[PDB]
Design a binder for this molecule. Structure first.
Ligand code: NAG
Lengths: 52, 105
């Protein structure tokens, strides 16, 4: 909810994170394979936000 | 904890043949092979808080008996779970096995 003000663009060359950001996962828990997801989502040429 | 002022409902005289010191049965020095007490095994929920000192390390284990007989006659009930939990460590162990080979007697 605090991060829904993002700039909903379509493509990027690299994502940027604040060092140890405060409002990350609002509910506490463990993000399985988080680092793998971050490495994959580093670059995207087309990012179409759909809904299944 | 203390050895005898924190587990009053769990016998801690853990004996084992493979861990002998000078021909007498024993167990580890940094751990404790709890085996119930008075023919039962109360559900323990012991905790600890590292607010004091620094980044401490915690060690523990789970014992897998080689048959259902040891489970039934030692912990007095089968399907026993172990669930350690912390801020970033919340995985569960459900040791229930009925056979093994023989290693180190
Ligand atoms: C141990 O058993 C006694 C009764 O025998 C009980 O009062 C006590 O609460 C038990 N220990 C714990 C940690 O609950």
């Amino acid at each position: 909810p605090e991060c829904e003000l993002l700039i909903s663009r379509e493509s990027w060359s690299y994502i940027v994170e604040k060092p140890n950001p405060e409002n990350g996962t609002c509910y506490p828990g463990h993000f399985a394979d988080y680092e793998e997801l971050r490495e994959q989502l580093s670059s995207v040429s087309s990012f179409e936000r759909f809904e299944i | 904890f203390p050895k005898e002022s924190s587990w009053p409902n769990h016998t801690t005289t853990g004996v084992s043949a493979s861990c002998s010191h000078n021909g007498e049965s024993s167990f580890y020095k940094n751990l404790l092979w709890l085996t119930g007490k008075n023919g039962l095994y109360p559900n323990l929920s012991k905790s600890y808080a590292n607010n004091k000192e620094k980044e401490v390390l915690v060690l523990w284990g789970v014992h897998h008996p080689p048959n259902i007989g040891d489970q039934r006659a030692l912990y007095h009930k089968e399907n026993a779970y172990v669930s350690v939990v912390s801020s970033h460590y919340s995985r569960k162990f459900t040791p229930e096995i009925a056979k093994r080979p023989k290693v180190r007697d």
